[PDB]
Structure 1
Amino acid sequence: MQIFVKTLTGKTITLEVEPSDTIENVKAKIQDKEGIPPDQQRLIFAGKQLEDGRTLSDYNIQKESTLHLVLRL
């Protein structure tokens, strides 16, 4: 499935993920395309901060869902 990740700057990163992917994987993929280390990333969906040990399905993240990237430091 495809998902979007919008930053504070307004830029949107488009990711291809599977629903079984964990949030560590998504942060690593964001690192791969943009260089941001996973410990500088903070991912939000549905107002909740998303935990690394969880999967995208646990947060009901579906195709073309958009997460929010805040930089965590």
Structure 2
Amino acid sequence: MQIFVKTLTGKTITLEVEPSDTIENVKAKIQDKEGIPPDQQRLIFAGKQLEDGRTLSDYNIQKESTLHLVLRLRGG
């Protein structure tokens, strides 16, 4: 399956995760894929909050599925 990600710029980044993988595993890909730190990363699907405990197959995520990459709270 080849999912995608929509950043703040809207840019669409293709991913090659699995329906058995996890969200935290997807973002991890967004880290290098884009080269951005997970400190300010948050993958969202169908405009819904995602968890590192959930799964794609559990989120109904499939192939060609586009996610949402937004920012998060400050750091400190």
Tell me the TM-score normalised to structure 2 length: 0.87
> Aligned residue for 2:44?
44
| Aligned residue-pair number | 73
> Aligned residue for 1:55?
55
Runs of 4 or more, structure 1, over 6 Å off, are: none
The structure that is strand-richer by fraction is 1
RMSD: 1.1
Q: CA deviation at 1:35?
A: 1.7
Q: Deviations over 1:7-66 (max 9, x none)?
A: 121211000111111111111111111122223111111221100111111110000010
Larger radius of gyration: 2
Further displaced range: 37-46 or 18-27:
37-46
Provide the C-alpha distance between the structure 1 equivalents of 2:62 and 2:39, rounded to a whole number of angstroms.
24
Query: Percent of aligned pairs with the same residue?
Result: 100
Tell me the TM-score normalised to structure 1 length: 0.90
Unaligned runs of 5+ in 2: none
Secondary structure (helix, strand or coil) at the match of 1:49 reads coil
